[PDB]
């Protein structure tokens, strides 16, 4: 964000109906800390959530540790407060080049930003995951692979898994159908994604 929100008005952006790829942000070395509670950071690509909220704010190194559940302090007691139970992940990085009297914090005190680590400003983004309030719509990314024809392969098409030979077909699938089944309730053909073609199994 060209400009981050203040801790007295931390931002809460609601993210839904999209694929959230956390591998670029996870591998990115520009972040100072990336602490996830509950789930390991490498399985978020498989897991899915109903909604995610992004709380964005600027704090100071003397309080950068305070973004965690069950913490006390002026910020934890009167400012951005983390809930008692399961939350998502906290991401933070040093922003001394940009934020080190325009920034103040919560009766009101201002940060003594002197650009000369413990007192430096840090930008914190908290990702809160709602996994039950509604049908789930935010899933992690899933990598595609190439399809090999005329060989016994173990395929997985949009969650339908199996083993068989994938070959070209002349079965006219309608635009809205993804896989077709023969008599006896078994798959006869499927429509590939990314390329929209009809493969017989």
């Amino acid at each position: 964000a060209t400009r981050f929100a203040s801790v007295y008005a931390w931002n809460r952006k609601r993210i839904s109906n999209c694929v959230a790829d956390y591998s670029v942000l996870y591998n990115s070395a520009s972040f100072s800390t990336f602490k996830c509670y509950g789930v390991s950071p490498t399985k978020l690509n498989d897991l899915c959530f109903t909604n995610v909220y992004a709380d964005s704010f600027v704090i100071r190194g003397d309080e950068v540790r305070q973004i965690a559940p069950g913490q006390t302090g002026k910020i934890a007691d009167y400012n951005y407060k983390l809930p008692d139970d399961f939350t998502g992940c906290v991401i933070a990085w040093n922003s001394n080049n940009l934020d080190s009297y325009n920034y103040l914090y919560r009766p009101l005190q201002s940060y003594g930003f002197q650009p000369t680590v413990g007192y430096q400003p840090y930008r914190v983004v908290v990702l809160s995951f709602e996994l039950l309030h509604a049908p789930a719509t935010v899933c992690g990314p899933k990598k595609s692979t190439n399809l090999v024809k005329n060989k016994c392969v173990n395929f997985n098409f949009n969650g339908l898994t199996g083993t068989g030979v994938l070959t070209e077909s002349n079965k006219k699938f309608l635009p809205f159908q993804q896989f077709g089944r023969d008599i006896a309730d078994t798959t006869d053909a499927v429509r590939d994604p990314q390329t929209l073609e009809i493969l017989d199994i």
Partner: antibody
């Protein structure tokens, strides 16, 4: 509706003192940061002072550092500006402006800008 | 302090013309700059804050741009009530300084 009705301006001899008032109504005065900005006759804008809610976090422009004192009020919600040791260069129309420096990093600007009060330093 | 060499000092344009007023900076002030419209005898009125976000209650014909140390600022359609003097104010390091100001008048 936000309303910054200004008063307390008038005629002062050089070297005298004067107290300015900037009343507020229609919003939470105690939760906002309040500023003073002046403009010399026919010249550009020049910032004066600022009080960010607390009675200790006061900041002044270099041209008025040490001479001008800013203060506020709870209850009735009004703003004051103590002006001391005036010279001929201090003649300007004084405005009290707003400020939401507390949360908003978007409305960093002066949302309203009162109508201003005239102070003339002359004998 | 931070100095702004806002140029030109004055420019002439006609009704409907596009107006650009440059406002420099000192040290990478990003988007902590505000714009003000002032009419004779009237208090300044916000025009562009954070170099891109238009204020509420302002007609959409007013627009701002720029970031860092250069700020472009763009007027789309001149209206006869838009005659005023415009000021750019740096708002990063303890906002103190204003701009010298440019007088925008209708070419005739």
């Amino acid at each position: 509706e936000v309303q910054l009705v200004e008063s307390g301006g008038g005629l002062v001899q050089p070297g005298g003192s004067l107290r300015l008032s900037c009343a507020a109504s229609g919003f939470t005065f105690s939760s906002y940061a309040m500023h003073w900005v002046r403009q010399a006759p026919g010249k550009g804008l020049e910032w004066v002072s600022a009080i960010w809610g607390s009675g200790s976090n006061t900041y002044y422009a270099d041209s008025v550092k040490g001479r001008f004192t800013i203060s506020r009020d709870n209850s009735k919600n009004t703003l004051y500006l103590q002006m001391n040791s005036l010279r001929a260069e201090d003649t300007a129309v004084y405005y009290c402006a707003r400020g939401r420096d507390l949360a908003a990093f978007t409305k960093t600007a002066f949302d309203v800008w009162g109508q201003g009060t005239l102070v003339t330093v002359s004998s | 302090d931070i100095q702004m060499t806002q140029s030109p000092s004055s420019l002439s344009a006609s009704v409907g013309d596009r107006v650009t007023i440059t406002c420099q900076a000192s040290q990478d002030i990003s988007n902590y700059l505000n714009w003000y419209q002032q009419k004779p005898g009237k208090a300044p009125k916000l025009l562009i804050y954070d170099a891109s976000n238009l204020e509420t209650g302002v007609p959409s014909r007013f627009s701002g741009s720029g970031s860092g140390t250069d700020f472009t600022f763009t007027i789309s359609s001149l209206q006869p009530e838009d005659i005023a003097t415009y000021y750019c104010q740096q708002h990063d390091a303890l906002p103190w300084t204003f701009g010298q100001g440019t007088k925008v008048e209708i070419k005739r």
